[PDB]
Design a protein around this nucleic acid. Structure first.
Ligand SMILES: [Zn+2]
Lengths: 62, 76, 33, 573, 234, 279, 336, 215
RNA sequence: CCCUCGA
C-alpha cells in the first residue's frame, strides 16, 4: 500500500488500506527509497552488500 | 591492446571484471577494502599491500590490490 | 526611408512597395484607452 | 571519462576535503581557520584543490532524465571560467543542445558511492545504448563530416596514382604512409586521391591477408601493398592495432558498424580510447572539410515554374469540376491534395537531379551528419501543402521556397502548422513522461534474482523466410527479436548436426551459422516463460544490451525496460 | 616585458629512431606559435642524402618487369627510396650495384664511393634467379625535405634514366599537440608535445637541436633589425 | 501591446484547449501569428499588429485600401473582423503597376472565413495597406523574415526582448526600417516636444530654447536600474547650438543608437566548423 | 555601519552591519564562560549583517536610508530600512547566450585569443564562428542572407552603370545603385532585397584600403588558420551579422553548495541560488540510480545529503577528521 | 644560400618585410609565428587607472561635461601612449570650459608621450571643469582593470582595462616559385607608439630566446 | 502557490 499510495489515487488507496488493516512488508525498492533503506537491487542485494573482504596471507607477508 | 590508461581508467575495467563475478561485487569489494585502508591510516586494520602513490585515494589503492589478486572475498 | 522623422539617420530601403499609411502611435492602445 | 569543472564550483563542492587537507599542511592552524580560509579563496587553496579532486569522480545530470544515461560519472578537471565543459560524445545520451542547457553536479562521498561512480556509472563504461545495444557515444555532426570528407575517394584528384605507359613510368606509389604525408605537406598529393602505399603497420582485409600471407597471417612490420587514399590510411590508424583495414567512404552507418564490431570483439577500454581518437580526427578534418553555407550553394530546380504551371492546369480542371457540380467539397480537396503532393514530389526530384554530390547542402545530409532531404526541398524547392489548425491540408499549396522567401499569405498559412506543431510537441513530451511513469511503476520490482531457472519453455522466433527461389529472405525483425537471446533448444537444421547449442548468446556469428545452415525458426528463452518465482533469472533474460554480456544478478531490468520504452516516446507522432 | 616561468624541454625515448619531447609550461597561445613552425622546420629544414635517379640495365622504354628478377620495376623503386644514405660530397655522386646468379640483392651489396654511407645494408632490394642479373646505377644527392619525381626530371635526361621521389629529410614523421598545463591559478597554460620519428642517420635529439639552431638564426634576422628592442626574456 | 487571454473574466489555464492557442484567420492584421511564448503560455499571449486599432466597442480593426473597378485607390477604411468577411482582400505582395490595375488576372486572396484562393482580380474589394501589416513590432524587425520558418521567427521575436543593453550601442547595418519608429514610440529615448535651439547641454540635462523665447529642459536618466537589473542610461546626441525640430530625438536610450533600436553589435562572422568548439 | 559609496565589494563583504538580540540559551558553553570571566556586560547578539551573495562583485553606486527616528514611513515593527545598489560591468564570457534575429542561438563555448582566430587576407580576424551544421535544418536562411547583405553594407558597393543599368538591378531604387562603406540599409519584411539583387551587389563590392576584394561573388573568402598559419583549403562564407547578448549569463547561473540552510518544515535543503540551496534529485533521477543499480549512492543522496539530521552533521564531521562516512540514519521526511 | 630580410616602408606606421628564400611550404608558418608574437607579446604602455575630482566611481556625471564618466573612459581607451619610465608614472589633465578637451590637453611627465593630440576626450560648457589623474605603466598584451582589493588603492581610484599592444593589424602572403622556394611578405601596421621595424625586432628577440629551448 | 521566462 506504500508503493501504491505513491503512484495514483492516493486517497482511495489509503482509505482501502486502512479499512483492510493492511501491513506493508517493505521489501520493495520504492519502499526502500521512501524509508531510506538500500534498494533490493544492484549493489543493495544481500549477496553483494554482505561481502566480506580479507587480504590473502601471501599479500600480508609482503 | 590499449594505450596508457589515465586516472579513473587505471586499472582497466576489463581485468577488474575478470577478477570478480559481477560488477556490483567489484563495487562492494573495492569499497569495503578502501574503508579498511582508511581505518588503518586513522587508527595508527591491515595497511596497503602495494606501494601507495603520494596522496593516492584509498579506493584507488583497493582497485590496484584487486587487480593484482592480493585479497579474497566471500559473497555470502 | 523613414523620412517623416526629422534628423533620422538615412537608411536606404529595398522596399519596392509604397506604404500609403504611416504606422500609428504604438502606445495608442494604452494611451487612447 | 573527464569533464570540465569551474574552479569556484569545485572549491564549494569539495570544501571539507580542502579544509582538512590544508589543515594537515601548515597552511591552516585549525579547522575553523581552514573554513574562513576557503571562504576568502586564499591563494593557498588552489594547489590543494588540485590534489583533493584527483580520481574523485562526480555525477553529471541533465533534465529531463529519460534513461539512466541521463546521469553519468566523470573525472573532474579544474577548468577556467564559470561553465561546465561536457565531452562531445555524451551529448547524445544527455540530449545536450548547448543552446543554454544547464547541468547539475553531485559529489559521491562514501567509499561505496565513489566505487559505484567509478565502476557502474563511469562515462566510458557505458558506451552502448542499454535499449538497442547500439553504440551511443559515437561520432556525429562535425565529427562524422570530418571523417566522411577524410575517407572520400575523389577521382582525378591531385597526386593520383597513374599507370606506367610507353616511356612514362608509374607514378603515385609511396614507400610508406610517412612519405605520402611528406608529399601531402607540399601541394603534390591530396588526402582524398587514390594511391598505392606500402603498409607494414596495418592488417590487410581478410581476402588480402589470406592470399598474400601464410600460416601466421599478417604481423606487425609485414609489408603489403594497398590501393587506397592516404585519408583512409590515416583513418585506419585510429582503429586498434590488428584491426583489418577498411577501405571505404565512411558514412555514419559504416562508422556505427565498425564501432559496434569493436564493442563486441574488443575490450571496452579500447572502444573508449578509439572513439576518442575518432573524435579528434573528425573535428580536425571537419574544420578543413570546406562545408559552409551560402545563397550560391542553395540551388533551385530549373523546371520548377513549368512543373507548378502544369499541376496548376490540373487544379483548374478540378475546380471547374467542382463548380460544375461533379465533385463534393471533400472530393475537390482530396483531388487538389493529390495534385500538389505530386507536384511537390516532382519539384523535389528535379531539385535532387540538379545538385552535385559535393555540394555542401548535399554532403552534410548524405554523410549521415545532420538533416534530411525534405528540409533541403523545403529550403530550395518549395514548401508545399500546409496543415490547418484542425490538421487537414489546405488545398492551396505554398509554392515558394524559403530561398525565394514566402508571400505574406503563404507565411500566415504556414504559421498554423508551425505553432500547432509546437504545442503538439509540448503535450507529446508530457504524455510520454506519464506513460514512462506508469511503466516504471508496473515494472519497478522486476529484478534478476537468480542465474538459471532451467525452464524448457520458450518462444519461437522467425529467423528468416524462404522465397519461391532458393534464396531465403532475411527477417527484418532479427535485430530486435532473435539477437541477444539465449537458446532454449539446439538447432537441428533439418539434418543430423546441431548448429548452435542451447544457452548460447545468439550473436552475429551464431546467427550467421544458423542462417547459412538454412534454419528459418528458433526457440529462445524469454522472460515471458521464465519460471523464477520472484523476478526473473539471468538466463531467461539473456544478454544485457549495455554490457553485451549476460545480465548480472541484481540488475533491475524492469526499470531499464521502462526507460528504454519511454525515452523514444517523444519522437512518436 | 615581463619574465615568464622558464619552460623546460624533456625527452621520452620511445625507440631508437623515435622520441617524444615536451616543452612546458608555455604562456597561453605560444604552444601553437612554436608548434607548426617546429614541425615544418624538422621536416623541411634538415639536410640529408637521397637517391634521385636510377639506371637499370635492361629496361629502356616500357618499365614493367625485369627478366630474371621477381620484383617489378616500381617495387625496386620503392625499395630504393627506402634506402638510408649519408653523403659529404655536396655534389651528385653515382654509386653502382651489380649482382649475378641466384640469390638475394640487398643494400649491403652496394659498393659505396668514398664519402657516402649506407646505414641499412640488410635492407632487401631484389631477389634473382639463376638466369637473371641486376645491374643498376644510383645518383645520390644532398637536399632538404621531400622533392617529387617530376622535379628530378632532367631537361637533357638520358634514355633509361628513371627519376624517383627523393626523401632528403632524415626525419620521417612529426606530429604535435598542445595540451593545457596549470600554473598557479591559470589552468590554460600551453604544453607542447612533439612526436618525432627519424631514420637511423640521426637521433631525434640532434634533429630537434638542428631545427632549433636554424630557427634561432631565422628569427635572429628579425631580432637584428634593432638589438635595443625589448622583448620577453625568460 | 500584449493581448492576454488569461485572467478574471477570461479562461483558466487548466480549461484552455489546443483550439484557443491556434492562429485564427481573423487574426490577420490584428494579432501577430509569430510573436507568442514557446512555453506553456503558447497561444495564450499575443502581440497587437503594427497597424491595428481597438475600436470603441473593444474589437480590433485593421486598415485596407478600397479597390474600385479593379483599381487600387488610396482611400483607407478600417474594417473589423466581421466586416472583413463580407469582402475580398488581396495580400500586399500582390503586384500593381503605376496604374491601379492588377498585374495578374488571378490573385491569391482571403475571401470567406479564411480560405486562400486564386481569385478573379475583377472582383476585389480591399487590399492590405502594406506587408508587415499582419506582424507585430518585434517581428517586423527581423530582416529577411520571409526566408525564415515560423518557429525560428518566433524564437527571434522573443529573443530580441531578452537582449541586455550594452555599455555602448550600435545600430545594425541591416535593418527592416522599423528600428527607429520602435525606439521613439517605446519612449526610452528623449524627444523634443517643440522645435528650437539647444541652449545648454551636459550629461545631466538638455535645455532647448524655443523660438517663443520659452525653453524646455530634459533631465537624463543616468545609470538607472530597470526592473530586471539592466542599465537604463540616456546620453545626449545633440550639441550646443544645434537646431532641432519637433519629434527629433535629443538623446539616446539604453538600446538606441541615433534614435534607432540597437539591440546588439555588428560582428564579423565566419560559417565553418572550427576544431569542435562550435560543435 | 553602512558601506561607503564607491567601494569595491566581493561576495562575503559587509554591505550593511546589523545585529539581532540573542537569548542566553543560544550561547555555546565556551562562549558563556568567556563572557562571564571577562566581565562583558554587553547585549548578547548575533551578526545578521547584509553581505554580498556568492558569485557577485561590483562598485557601490548608491545608498538610500529610511529611519523611524525621522518621519520616514515604514511598515509596522521596522525601525530602519537601508538599500544598497551595486553595479557590475559584465564582460562577455564562456556560457553567455548570444542570438541573432532569426532564432539562431547558442552559448559561447570558447573565447579565443585574437591571434588564433581565422583571419582574412588583409589580417582582419573574424569576430564570431558559427557552425555550418546548425544552419540548414533549422530553415532560417535569412541569417545567411543578412550575412551577405551585412558584408555589402560594411564594404560599400558601386554597381556598374556604364553600359547601362544591369537587369538584376533594374528594380533597385536609384539610391541603392551605390553605397559608401558602413552604409545602413533596411530590408523590410515581405518587401526585401531580392535574391538576385543581393547576388548582384555581391559582385560590385568595394575593395579595402589596399584595393583588394576580400569576398567573392559567392559571399565567401579565403581564411588563414590563426594557429598553424596555413590557409584553410576552401573559401568560407564570411560577412557581418547582428548578434545580441541575451540575459541568460553564467554569472547568474553558476551555483554550488557543500552544505547550507535547510527548510524548517521538511528538513531538506532549500532551493534556488539566492537561498544558497541544493539541486533537486527527483523521481526520474532516482529511476536512473535504480537502473544503474547503485544503492549506496541513492541512499546517500536521500539520507545524509538531504534528510537525515544526525547523519548530515556526522558526515561533515567525518570528512574534516578524514574518517569513513558513517552509515545513514532515518530520513526526516518519512517521520513527517 | 641563406635567407635575408628587407624592409620596405609604406606609411610611417606601416611596413612590409620580405624574407627570402625559404624552403617550399615554410613561409606560412613563419609569417604566422611572427604574427602570433606580434599581436600578443609586443611590449607597450597604457593607462592603468584614473582619478577624477569629485567622482568616486565610474557610473556618474561631471557637472557641465557632456559625456558621462563611463563614456569618458571609453574615449580614453583610444589613447596611444609611450612610456620609458618602467614604473608607474602620473599624467595630469586640468581644463576649464567651455571647449573641447582632447588628448593634447594632457600634461605628461618627462619620459612619456601622447601620440594622438587630437583625440576627443570630453566636451565642456561654461560650467564644466575637468581635473583628472592618469596612471601609466609598461606591460604587454591586455590586463583587465586591477581590482582595488588586489591593491592598496583607495576609493577615489578607478582602474581601467589596459591594452598595451602597440601593433594594429598584421598579415602576410607568400610567393611560391632557384628551384622551388617560398618568398615571405609580412605586413605590419602599428600605432604611432612605435615603428613596425621595432615591433618586428622585439618579436624577433622573443622568438629567438623562446626557440632556444630547442637547442 | 501564482505571474513570466530558459532547456
Ligand atoms: Zn528463467
Amino acid at each position: 500500500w506504500l508503493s501504491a499510495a505513491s503512484f495514483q489515487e492516493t486517497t482511495r488507496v489509503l482509505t482501502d488500506a486502512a479499512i483492510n488493516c493492511r501491513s506493508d512488508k517493505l521489501n520493495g525498492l520504492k519502499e526502500n527509497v521512501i524509508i531510506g533503506k538500500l534498494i533490493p537491487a544492484g549493489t543493495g542485494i544481500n549477496r553483494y552488500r554482505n561481502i566480506a573482504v580479507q587480504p590473502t596471507e601471501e599479500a600480508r607477508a609482503a | 591492446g590499449y594505450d596508457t590508461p589515465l586516472g579513473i581508467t587505471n586499472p582497466p575495467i576489463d581485468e577488474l571484471l575478470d577478477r570478480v563475478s559481477s560488477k556490483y561485487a567489484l563495487v562492494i569489494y573495492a569499497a569495503k577494502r578502501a574503508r579498511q585502508i582508511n581505518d588503518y591510516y586513522n587508527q595508527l586494520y591491515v595497511g596497503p599491500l602495494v606501494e601507495p602513490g603520494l596522496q593516492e585515494k584509498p579506493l584507488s589503492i583497493a582497485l590496484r590490490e584487486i587487480h593484482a589478486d592480493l585479497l579474497e572475498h566471500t559473497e555470502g | 526611408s523613414n523620412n517623416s522623422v526629422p534628423g533620422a539617420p538615412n537608411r536606404v530601403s529595398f522596399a519596392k512597395l509604397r506604404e500609403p499609411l504611416e504606422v500609428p502611435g504604438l502606445l495608442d492602445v494604452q494611451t487612447d484607452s | 571519462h573527464q569533464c570540465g569543472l569551474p574552479k569556484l564550483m569545485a572549491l564549494e563542492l569539495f570544501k571539507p576535503f580542502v579544509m582538512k587537507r590544508l589543515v594537515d599542511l601548515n597552511h591552516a592552524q585549525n579547522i575553523k581557520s581552514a573554513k574562513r580560509m576557503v571562504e576568502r579563496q586564499r591563494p593557498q587553496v588552489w594547489d590543494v584543490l588540485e590534489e583533493v579532486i584527483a580520481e574523485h569522480p562526480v555525477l553529471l545530470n541533465r533534465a529531463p532524465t529519460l534513461h539512466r544515461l541521463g546521469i553519468q560519472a566523470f573525472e573532474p578537471m579544474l577548468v577556467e571560467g564559470k561553465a561546465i565543459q561536457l565531452h562531445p560524445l555524451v551529448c547524445e545520451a544527455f540530449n545536450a543542445d548547448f543552446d543554454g542547457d544547464q547541468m547539475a553536479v553531485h559529489l559521491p562521498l562514501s567509499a561505496e558511492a565513489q566505487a559505484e561512480a567509478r565502476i557502474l556509472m563511469l562515462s566510458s563504461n557505458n558506451i552502448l545504448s542499454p535499449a538497442s545495444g547500439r553504440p551511443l557515444a559515437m561520432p556525429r555532426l562535425d565529427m562524422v563530416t570530418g571523417l566522411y570528407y577524410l575517407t572520400t575517394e575523389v577521382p582525378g584528384d591531385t597526386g593520383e596514382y597513374q599507370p606506367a605507359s610507353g616511356d612514362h613510368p608509374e607514378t603515385g606509389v609511396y614507400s610508406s604512409p610517412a612519405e605520402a604525408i611528406m608529399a601531402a605537406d607540399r601541394g603534390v598529393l591530396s588526402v582524398r586521391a587514390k594511391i598505392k602505399v606500402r603498409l607494414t603497420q596495418l592488417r590487410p582485409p581478410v581476402e588480402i591477408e589470406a592470399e598474400l600471407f601464410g600460416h601466421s597471417g599478417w604481423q606487425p612490420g609485414d609489408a603489403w601493398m594497398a590501393e587506397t587514399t592516404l585519408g583512409r590510411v590515416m583513418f585506419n590508424e585510429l582503429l586498434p592495432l590488428g584491426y583489418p583495414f577498411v577501405n571505404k567512404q565512411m558514412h555514419k552507418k559504416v562508422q556505427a558498424a565498425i564501432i559496434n564490431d569493436l564493442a563486441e570483439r574488443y575490450p571496452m577500454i579500447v572502444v573508449a580510447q578509439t572513439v576518442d581518437k575518432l573524435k579528434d580526427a573528425g573535428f580536425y578534418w571537419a574544420t578543413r572539410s570546406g562545408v559552409t553555407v551560402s545563397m550560391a550553394d542553395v540551388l533551385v530546380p530549373p523546371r520548377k515554374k513549368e512543373i507548378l504551371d502544369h499541376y496548376e492546369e490540373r487544379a483548374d480542371k478540378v475546380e471547374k469540376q467542382f463548380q460544375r457540380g461533379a465533385l463534393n467539397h471533400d472530393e475537390r480537396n482530396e483531388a487538389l491534395v493529390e495534385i500538389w503532393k505530386e507536384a511537390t514530389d516532382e519539384v523535389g526530384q528535379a531539385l535532387r537531379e540538379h545538385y552535385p554530390d559535393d555540394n555542401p547542402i548535399i554532403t552534410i545530409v548524405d554523410s549521415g551528419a545532420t538533416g534530411n532531404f525534405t528540409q533541403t526541398r523545403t529550403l530550395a524547392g518549395m514548401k508545399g501543402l500546409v496543415t490547418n489548425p484542425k490538421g487537414e491540408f489546405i488545398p492551396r499549396p505554398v509554392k515558394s521556397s524559403f530561398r525565394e522567401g514566402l508571400t505574406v499569405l503563404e507565411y500566415f498559412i504556414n504559421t498554423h502548422g508551425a505553432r500547432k506543431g509546437l504545442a503538439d510537441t509540448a503535450l507529446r513530451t508530457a504524455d510520454s513522461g506519464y506513460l514512462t511513469r506508469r511503466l516504471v511503476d508496473v515494472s519497478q520490482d522486476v529484478i534478476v534474482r537468480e542465474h538459471d531457472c532451467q525452464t524448457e519453455r520458450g518462444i519461437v522466433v522467425e529467423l528468416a523466410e524462404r522465397a519461391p527461389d532458393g534464396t531465403l529472405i532475411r527477417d527484418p525483425y532479427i535485430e530486435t527479436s532473435a539477437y541477444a537471446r539465449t537458446l532454449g533448444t539446439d538447432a537441428v537444421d533439418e539434418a543430423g548436426n546441431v548448429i548452435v547449442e542451447r544457452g548460447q548468446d545468439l550473436g552475429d556469428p551464431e546467427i550467421d551459422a544458423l542462417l547459412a545452415a538454412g534454419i528459418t525458426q528458433v526457440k529462445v528463452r524469454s522472460v515471458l516463460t521464465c519460471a523464477t518465482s520472484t523476478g526473473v533469472c539471468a538466463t531467461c533474460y539473456g544478454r544485457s544490451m549495455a554490457t553485451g554480456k549476460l545480465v548480472d544478478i541484481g540488475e533491475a531490468v524492469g526499470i531499464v525496460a521502462a526507460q528504454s520504452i519511454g525515452e523514444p516516446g517523444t519522437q512518436l507522432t | 616585458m615581463l619574465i615568464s616561468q622558464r619552460p623546460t624541454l624533456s625527452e621520452d625515448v620511445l625507440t631508437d629512431n623515435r622520441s617524444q619531447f615536451v616543452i612546458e609550461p608555455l604562456e597561453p597561445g605560444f604552444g601553437y606559435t612554436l608548434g607548426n613552425s617546429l614541425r615544418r622546420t624538422l621536416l623541411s629544414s634538415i639536410p640529408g642524402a637521397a637517391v634521385t635517379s636510377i639506371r637499370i640495365d635492361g629496361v629502356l622504354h616500357e618499365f614493367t618487369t625485369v627478366p630474371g628478377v621477381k620484383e617489378d620495376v616500381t617495387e625496386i623503386i620503392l625499395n630504393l627510396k627506402s634506402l638510408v644514405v649519408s653523403s659529404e660530397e655536396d655534389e651528385p655522386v653515382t654509386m653502382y650495384l651489380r649482382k649475378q646468379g641466384p640469390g638475394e640483392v640487398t643494400a649491403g651489396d652496394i659498393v659505396p664511393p668514398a664519402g657516402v654511407t649506407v646505414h641499412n645494408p640488410g635492407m632487401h632490394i631484389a631477389t634473382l634467379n639463376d638466369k637473371g642479373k641486376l645491374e643498376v646505377e644510383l645518383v645520390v644527392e644532398r637536399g632538404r625535405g621531400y622533392v617529387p619525381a617530376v622535379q628530378n626530371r632532367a631537361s637533357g635526361a638520358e634514355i633509361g634514366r628513371i627519376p624517383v621521389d627523393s626523401i632528403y629529410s632524415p626525419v620521417l614523421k612529426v606530429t604535435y599537440k598542445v595540451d593545457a598545463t596549470r600554473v598557479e591559478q591559470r589552468t590554460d597554460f600551453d604544453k607542447l608535445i612533439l612526436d618525432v620519428e627519424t631514420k637511423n642517420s640521426i637521433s631525434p635529439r640532434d634533429a630537434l637541436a638542428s631545427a632549433g639552431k636554424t630557427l634561432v638564426e631565422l628569427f635572429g634576422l628579425a631580432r637584428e633589425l634593432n638589438v635595443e628592442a625589448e622583448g620577453i626574456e625568460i | 501591446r500584449r493581448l492576454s487571454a488569461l485572467g478574471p473574466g477570461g479562461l483558466s489555464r487548466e480549461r484552455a484547449g489546443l483550439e484557443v492557442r491556434d492562429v485564427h484567420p481573423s487574426h490577420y492584421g490584428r494579432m501577430c501569428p509569430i510573436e507568442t511564448p514557446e512555453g506553456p503560455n503558447i497561444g495564450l499571449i499575443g502581440s497587437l499588429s503594427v497597424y491595428a486599432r481597438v475600436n470603441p466597442f473593444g474589437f480590433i480593426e485593421t486598415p485596407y485600401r478600397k479597390v474600385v473597378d479593379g483599381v487600387v485607390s488610396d482611400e483607407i477604411v478600417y474594417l473589423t473582423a466581421d466586416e472583413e468577411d463580407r469582402h475580398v482582400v488581396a495580400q500586399a505582395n500582390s503586384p500593381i503597376d503605376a496604374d491601379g490595375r492588377f498585374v495578374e488576372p488571378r490573385v491569391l486572396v482571403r475571401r470567406k472565413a479564411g480560405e486562400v484562393e486564386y481569385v478573379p482580380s475583377s472582383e476585389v474589394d480591399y487590399m492590405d495597406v502594406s506587408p508587415r501589416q499582419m506582424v507585430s513590432v518585434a517581428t517586423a524587425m527581423i530582416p529577411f523574415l520571409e526566408h525564415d520558418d515560423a518557429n525560428r521567427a518566433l524564437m527571434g521575436a522573443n529573443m530580441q526582448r531578452q537582449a541586455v543593453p550594452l555599455v555602448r550601442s550600435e545600430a545594425p547595418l541591416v535593418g527592416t526600417g522599423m528600428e527607429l519608429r520602435a525606439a521613439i514610440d517605446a519612449g526610452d529615448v528623449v524627444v523634443a516636444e517643440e522645435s528650437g535651439v539647444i541652449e545648454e547641454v551636459s550629461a545631466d540635462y538638455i535645455t532647448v530654447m524655443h523660438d517663443n523665447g520659452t525653453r524646455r529642459t530634459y533631465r537624463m536618466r543616468k545609470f538607472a536600474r530597470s526592473n530586471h537589473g539592466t542599465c537604463a542610461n540616456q546620453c545626449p546626441i545633440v550639441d550646443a547650438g544645434d537646431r532641432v525640430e519637433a519629434g527629433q530625438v535629443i538623446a539616446d536610450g539604453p538600446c538606441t543608437d541615433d534614435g534607432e533600436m540597437a539591440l546588439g553589435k555588428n560582428l564579423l562572422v565566419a560559417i565553418m566548423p572550427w576544431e569542435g568548439h562550435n560543435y | 555601519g553602512i558601506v561607503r559609496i564607491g567601494a569595491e565589494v566581493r561576495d562575503g563583504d559587509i554591505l550593511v552591519g546589523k545585529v539581532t538580540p540573542k537569548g542566553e540559551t543560544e550561547l555555546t558553553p565556551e562562549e558563556r564562560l568567556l563572557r562571564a570571566i571577562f566581565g562583558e556586560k554587553a547585549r548578547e547578539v548575533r551578526d545578521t549583517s547584509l553581505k554580498v551573495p556568492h558569485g557577485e562583485s561590483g562598485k557601490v553606486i548608491g545608498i538610500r536610508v529610511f529611519s523611524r527616528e525621522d518621519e520616514d514611513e515604514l511598515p509596522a515593527g521596522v525601525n530602519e530600512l537601508v538599500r544598497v545598489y551595486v553595479a557590475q560591468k559584465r564582460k562577455i564570457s564562456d556560457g553567455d547566450k548570444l542570438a541573432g534575429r532569426h532564432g539562431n542561438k547558442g552559448v559561447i563555448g570558447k573565447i579565443l585569443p585574437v591571434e588564433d582566430m581565422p583571419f582574412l587576407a588583409d589580417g582582419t580576424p573574424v569576430d564570431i564562428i558559427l557552425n555550418t551544421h546548425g544552419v540548414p535544418r533549422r530553415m532560417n536562411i535569412g541569417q545567411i542572407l543578412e550575412t551577405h547583405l551585412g558584408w555589402c553594407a560594411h564594404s560599400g558597393w558601386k554597381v556598374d552603370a556604364a553600359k547601362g543599368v544591369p537587369d538584376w538591378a533594374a528594380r533597385l531604387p536609384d539610391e541603392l545603385l551605390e553605397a559608401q562603406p558602413n552604409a545602413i540599409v533596411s530590408t523590410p519584411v515581405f518587401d526585401g532585397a531580392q535574391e538576385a539583387e543581393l547576388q548582384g551587389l555581391l559582385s560590385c563590392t568595394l575593395p579595402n584600403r589596399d584595393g583588394d576584394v576580400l569576398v567573392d561573388a559567392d559571399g565567401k573568402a579565403m581564411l588563414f588558420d590563426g594557429r598553424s598559419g596555413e590557409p584553410f583549403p576552401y573559401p568560407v562564407t564570411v560577412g557581418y551579422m547582428y548578434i545580441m547578448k541575451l540575459h541568460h549569463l553564467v554569472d547568474d547561473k553558476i551555483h554550488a553548495r557543500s552544505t547550507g540552510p535547510y527548510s524548517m518544515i521538511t528538513q531538506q535543503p532549500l532551493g534556488g541560488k539566492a537561498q544558497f540551496g541544493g539541486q533537486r534529485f527527483g523521481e526520474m533521477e532516482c529511476w536512473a540510480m535504480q537502473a544503474y543499480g547503485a544503492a549506496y549512492t541513492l541512499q546517500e543522496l536521500l539520507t545524509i545529503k538531504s534528510d537525515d539530521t544526525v547523519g548530515r552533521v556526522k558526515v561533515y564531521e567525518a570528512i574534516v577528521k578524514g574518517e569513513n562516512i558513517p552509515e545513514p540514519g532515518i530520513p526526516e521526511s518519512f517521520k513527517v
